[PDB]
Design a binder for these strands. Structure first.
Ligand SMILES: [Mg+2]
Ligand SMILES: [Mg+2]
Ligand SMILES: [Mg+2]
Ligand SMILES: [Mg+2]
Ligand SMILES: [Mg+2]
Ligand SMILES: [Mg+2]
Ligand SMILES: [Mg+2]
Ligand SMILES: [Mg+2]
Ligand SMILES: [Mg+2]
Ligand SMILES: [Mg+2]
Ligand SMILES: [Mg+2]
Ligand SMILES: [Mg+2]
Ligand SMILES: [Mg+2]
Ligand SMILES: [Mg+2]
Ligand SMILES: [Mg+2]
Ligand SMILES: [Mg+2]
Ligand SMILES: [Mg+2]
Ligand SMILES: [Mg+2]
Ligand SMILES: [Mg+2]
Ligand SMILES: [Mg+2]
Ligand SMILES: [Mg+2]
Ligand SMILES: [Mg+2]
Ligand SMILES: [Mg+2]
Ligand SMILES: [Mg+2]
Ligand SMILES: [Mg+2]
Ligand SMILES: [Mg+2]
Ligand SMILES: [Mg+2]
Ligand SMILES: [Mg+2]
Ligand SMILES: [Mg+2]
Ligand SMILES: [Mg+2]
Ligand SMILES: [Mg+2]
Ligand SMILES: [Mg+2]
Ligand SMILES: [Mg+2]
Ligand SMILES: [Mg+2]
Ligand SMILES: [Mg+2]
Ligand SMILES: [Mg+2]
Ligand SMILES: [Mg+2]
Ligand SMILES: [Mg+2]
Ligand SMILES: [Mg+2]
Ligand SMILES: [Mg+2]
Ligand SMILES: [Mg+2]
Ligand SMILES: [Mg+2]
Ligand SMILES: [Mg+2]
Ligand SMILES: [Mg+2]
Ligand SMILES: [Mg+2]
Ligand SMILES: [Mg+2]
Ligand SMILES: [Mg+2]
Ligand SMILES: [Mg+2]
Ligand SMILES: [Zn+2]
Lengths: 208, 151, 138, 237
RNA sequence: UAGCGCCGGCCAACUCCGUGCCAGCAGCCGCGGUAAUACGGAGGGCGCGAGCGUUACCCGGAUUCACUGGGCGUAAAGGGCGUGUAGGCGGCCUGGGGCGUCCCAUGUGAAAGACCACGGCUCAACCGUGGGGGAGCGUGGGAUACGCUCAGGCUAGACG
RNA sequence: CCUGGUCCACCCGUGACGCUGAGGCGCGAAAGCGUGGGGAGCAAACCGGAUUAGAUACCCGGGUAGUCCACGCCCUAAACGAUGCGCGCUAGGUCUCUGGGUCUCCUGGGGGCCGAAGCUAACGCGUUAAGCGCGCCGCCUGGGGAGUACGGCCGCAAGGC
RNA sequence: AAAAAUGCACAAAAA
């Protein structure tokens, strides 16, 4: 299924902190502080001028790497975001962002999107009152996502919530923190969320 | 302020009794992404020099590129020798659809959204030279009316 | 002989301009006037005057151009850059209104005969007609 | 004063080249008599106006006109009349690049400077009996070509040519540089690669004296003061 | 449970060893003759992941059958030259008719499918409900510039 | 002697009677073929002498078809301007053939060079277009296999399409 | 207007 295993070797390969991990990527590792170079033997060698395709390849790889999503699923969305009444880059991002697993991390119920996914899929999340297991669920404006009552104790979440105080969620979102719930107000912009990604490149990549 | 991009570097050769002696061409684009671009073809005995005069010659040859919304006024086509470029404008949200040579040129001046096809000889030197003369002849309603008035 | 009197004229002009002649005559006709009518009205020519050469009716057409330019090759721009025949004797081109062209995203004109007379893409699309497409200019 | 009448003109100065004509030149030819194309002097003055005005405008606004001609007719009349306005000129073998390669050709002017530095001045005796004549010889040829060119270490805003055919290069050099081209045009060459046009006999030294004389005056009168007529009739047949 | 393909350029990913025009690779250009990023193992990287590869076939890139959108002096390409059958094309002016063309009106263009919305399965795939429409062809009403046809005039083509 | 095309001047007649042209038909260098004739010079084949390692060649001496005529076939070609035909449009310069004129000059139909614009991959072309356009015909679609095979049609054959 | 035939398979690099 979804990528398993060494994640900070991606942080490194792409050459930007993707924050695919939890807090550790905010500490002085991420792997990124110690060794800000690509993995394996050759990482400390002088780079060569990257190919035009290479450039688009990585940009796409990064963006995908971020939401930690399969190339199958990822391509769907991009084709979905193609036609597209839309500016097509943005549309793609909105959709990516609408993922229940993405939103849950965005709403800080969980620290890492990889942690978000197990959260959704173990029964520890609810959409509009309903239990929802599937990280790929597309949320739309007005949706109330919340920790299910069945386990609201769950040291992990309370820890993630009680520490979520001291934080302010993205504009398109809102979170009531004493109630273990939150709401999806709208679709995030290009502006609304800055990503390391150049979205104009991911499009040029599927131009093939 | 200005931005350089090289689309091509060639080693060519002449023959002397000795053997092959080489020389280097360099194709360079120059532009501010504000609607100014230029193209020049440098040749000297080593790469950097030839990339240097490439940039140099570039700036001494330029073009008015009448963008509107990051695209072009009308659909144009030009031929330079046997090479041909068709330039068609696009709505916003499209992107620049081009092969490496005309992409580079179209990018360094405006043009967030365009449609192109190369036809004929795809030789990049002559396709580049065909693109410049293609921008060069772009015209707007302004030029159009000021062209047909009288007096 | 002249298989295509219209296309001859259009070419007569194309050839005229590119040498920067002030004026050139074409063999005269009711149809060529109605076209040439549209050509001055849209600004591509100053216009024409019926004349006679060796007793024979002509249309002396007065060419239009740009300003003398700077740099080498001072020769002006062109009012008519491009003019080409479309529906021809060899193949006839008949477009319904919905199928009418837009030349250079509107900067150019497409002249076309319809049963409401000789019109333009704009002109024809408004009366709502379509018909035999004569040529395109810009 | 500034302008001129046809009286002195009409004698030697109307029409020159027989059938060697560039056809672009129609407008300025009236009829053909004597097998020789005859220039229409009415339309000369028509132009001689629009031109002179651009000169006078350029003079009283303080900018330069470069004088060129290589023919044996305009060779003398140019050296005089150009220094008379204190202007740059070429009467000798117009060099390639002299405009498009300017910063480079001019490094030969600076060399001319260094060569002047040694005439009677010291350090000249210190050079070998041989190398003397050699270095001096390079000055003497340097002198020949760069006399007129020496002035104006910057490229002009105009150039004035006698035969725009005889120096095409010159015109094209300027034309490439957006440098306005004024010249005294014959049937010999064509209009239209000339910006401001002076349409009359390119040969016939008599004709050259008349036009270039009062062409320099028009500049003097514009910049400040005036002067007496310049030397003309010395040889003159 | 994790596997598979690749890392000479095209094409994203490089180093050691072994081998020595051998064994072998190979989509095209091509690698291997004792230092091989191209063979084989390795470590290491790139890609995709319950899949990854291969073979076969279709379309695309191929304006490389060119209607859109090509060509024919020397690149493939003007018939050895005429005369002429059919067919194709056809100057200037005016009327008739309305065949082509053009406009409106209308019948038909099944359902499914596709496109656009909204919903139903925990999402999705699937699936439901509604919307959007041609083209063509029938009928009816009209238009007549152009092409046609029919009639009449012309001299600029062509013949005498 | 019979006979085709062609151009000029006059501006008289017909009134679009036009262009092109798949098939068809006809013409079609040389060589070749049949039946006669004719045969000097030339000369495939062939012989001889030189040369050479060889010399079934190049050079030399001979030399038969053939070359020539009539009739009848064959239908090919670097049959080339390697450039289909008709028309209109787009600077000039210069040489030349042949008409007409108010015979320096102007004008028309041919034949050559240089060249405007434009074209072209270049070389080049350029009012004798390879420019700008329209009509209609022929043809191209990687190299070899192969202008071969098969079939069909044609030829006396060679052989041709 | 020339006495005189022939030459071993595959093979770098000058980013
Ligand atoms: Mg439990
Ligand atoms: Mg071409
Ligand atoms: Mg290629
Ligand atoms: Mg010199
Ligand atoms: Mg692969
Ligand atoms: Mg690579
Ligand atoms: Mg070894
Ligand atoms: Mg080794
Ligand atoms: Mg080796
Ligand atoms: Mg290796
Ligand atoms: Mg490989
Ligand atoms: Mg290996
Ligand atoms: Mg195709
Ligand atoms: Mg076609
Ligand atoms: Mg082709
Ligand atoms: Mg050929
Ligand atoms: Mg032929
Ligand atoms: Mg017929
Ligand atoms: Mg007709
Ligand atoms: Mg009808
Ligand atoms: Mg249906
Ligand atoms: Mg739903
Ligand atoms: Mg439905
Ligand atoms: Mg009639
Ligand atoms: Mg006769
Ligand atoms: Mg008559
Ligand atoms: Mg009559
Ligand atoms: Mg024969
Ligand atoms: Mg014979
Ligand atoms: Mg025999
Ligand atoms: Mg015989
Ligand atoms: Mg016999
Ligand atoms: Mg005999
Ligand atoms: Mg013998
Ligand atoms: Mg022997
Ligand atoms: Mg013999
Ligand atoms: Mg003999
Ligand atoms: Mg034949
Ligand atoms: Mg042939
Ligand atoms: Mg002639
Ligand atoms: Mg030219
Ligand atoms: Mg084959
Ligand atoms: Mg044969
Ligand atoms: Mg057979
Ligand atoms: Mg044949
Ligand atoms: Mg041998
Ligand atoms: Mg060899
Ligand atoms: Mg080998
Ligand atoms: Zn990290």
């Amino acid at each position: 299924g979804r990528y398993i295993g060494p994640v900070c070797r991606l942080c490194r390969r792409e050459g930007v902190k993707l924050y695919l991990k939890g807090e550790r990527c905010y500490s002085p590792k991420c792997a990124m502080e110690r060794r800000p170079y690509p993995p394996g033997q050759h990482g400390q060698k002088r780079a060569r001028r990257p190919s035009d395709y290479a450039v688009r390849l990585r940009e796409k790889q990064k963006l995908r790497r971020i939401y930690g999503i399969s190339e199958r699923q990822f391509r769907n969305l991009f084709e979905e975001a193609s036609k597209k009444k839309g500016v097509t880059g943005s549309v793609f991002l909105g959709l990516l962002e609408s993922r229940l697993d993405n939103v849950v991390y965005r709403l800080g119920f969980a620290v890492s999107r990889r942690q978000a996914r197990q959260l959704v899929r173990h029964g520890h999340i609810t959409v509009n009152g309903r239990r929802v297991d599937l990280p790929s669920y597309r949320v739309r404006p007005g949706d109330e996502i919340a920790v299910a009552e069945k386990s609201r104790n769950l040291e992990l979440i309370r820890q993630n919530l009680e520490a979520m105080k001291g934080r302010k969620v993205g504009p398109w979102l809102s979170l009531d923190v004493e109630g273990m719930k939150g709401k999806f107000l709208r679709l995030p912009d290009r502006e609304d969320l800055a990503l390391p990604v150049n979205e104009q490149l991911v499009i040029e990549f599927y131009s093939r | 302020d200005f931005e350089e991009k090289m689309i091509l570097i060639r080693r060519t050769a002449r023959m002397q009794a000795g053997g092959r002696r080489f020389r280097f061409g360099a194709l360079v684009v120059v532009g501010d992404r504000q609607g100014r671009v230029g193209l020049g073809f440098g040749k000297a005995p080593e790469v950097p020099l030839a990339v240097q005069k490439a940039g140099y010659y570039a700036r001494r040859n330029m073009v008015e590129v009448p963008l509107q919304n990051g695209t072009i006024p009308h659909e144009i086509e030009v031929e330079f020798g046997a090479s041909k470029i068709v330039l068609k404008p696009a709505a916003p949200g499209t992107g620049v659809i081009a092969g490496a040579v005309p992409r580079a040129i179209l990018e360094l001046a405006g043009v967030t959204d365009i449609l192109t096809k190369e036809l004929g000889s795809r030789n990049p030197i002559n396709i580049a030279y065909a693109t410049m003369e293609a921008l060069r002849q772009l015209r707007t309603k302004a030029d159009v009316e000021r062209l047909r008035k009288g007096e | 002989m002249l298989t295509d009197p219209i296309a001859d004229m259009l070419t007569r002009i194309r050839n005229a301009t590119r040498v920067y002649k002030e004026s050139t005559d074409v063999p005269a006709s009711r149809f060529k006037e109605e076209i040439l009518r549209i050509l001055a009205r849209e600004g591509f020519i100053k216009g024409y005057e019926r004349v006679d050469v060796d007793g024979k009716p002509y249309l002396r057409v007065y060419l239009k151009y740009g300003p003398r330019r700077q740099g080498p090759d001072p020769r002006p721009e062109q009012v008519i850059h491009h003019i080409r025949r479309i529906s021809k004797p060899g193949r006839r081109v008949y477009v319904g209104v919905k199928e009418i062209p837009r030349v250079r995203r509107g900067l150019g004109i497409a002249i076309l005969s319809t049963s409401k007379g000789v019109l333009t893409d704009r002109e024809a699309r408004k009366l709502g007609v379509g018909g035999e497409l004569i040529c395109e200019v810009w | 004063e500034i302008t001129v009448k046809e009286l002195l003109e009409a004698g030697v100065h109307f029409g020159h080249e027989r059938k060697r004509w560039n056809p672009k030149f129609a407008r300025y030819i009236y009829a053909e008599r004597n097998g020789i194309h005859i220039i229409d002097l009415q339309k000369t003055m028509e132009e001689l106006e629009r031109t002179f005005r651009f000169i006078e405008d350029l003079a009283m606004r303080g900018g330069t006109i470069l004088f060129v001609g290589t023919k044996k007719q305009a060779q003398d009349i140019v050296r005089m009349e150009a220094e008379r306005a204190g202007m740059p000129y070429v009467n000798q073998r117009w060099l390639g690049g002299m405009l498009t390669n300017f910063k480079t050709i001019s490094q030969r002017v600076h060399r001319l400077e260094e060569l002047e530095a040694l005439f009677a001045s010291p350090e000249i005796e210190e050079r070998p009996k041989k190398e003397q004549v050699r270095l001096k010889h390079e000055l003497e040829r340097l002198q020949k070509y760069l006399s007129g060119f020496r002035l104006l270490k910057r490229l002009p805003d105009a150039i004035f040519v006698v035969d725009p055919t005889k120096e095409a290069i010159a015109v094209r050099e300027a034309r490439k540089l957006f440098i306005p081209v004024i010249a005294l045009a014959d049937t010999d060459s064509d209009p239209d690669l000339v910006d401001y046009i002076i349409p009359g006999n390119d040969d016939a030294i008599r004709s050259i004296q008349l036009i270039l004389s009062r062409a320099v005056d028009l500049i003097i009168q514009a910049r400040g003061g005036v002067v007496e007529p310049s030397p003309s009739y010395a040889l003159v047949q």
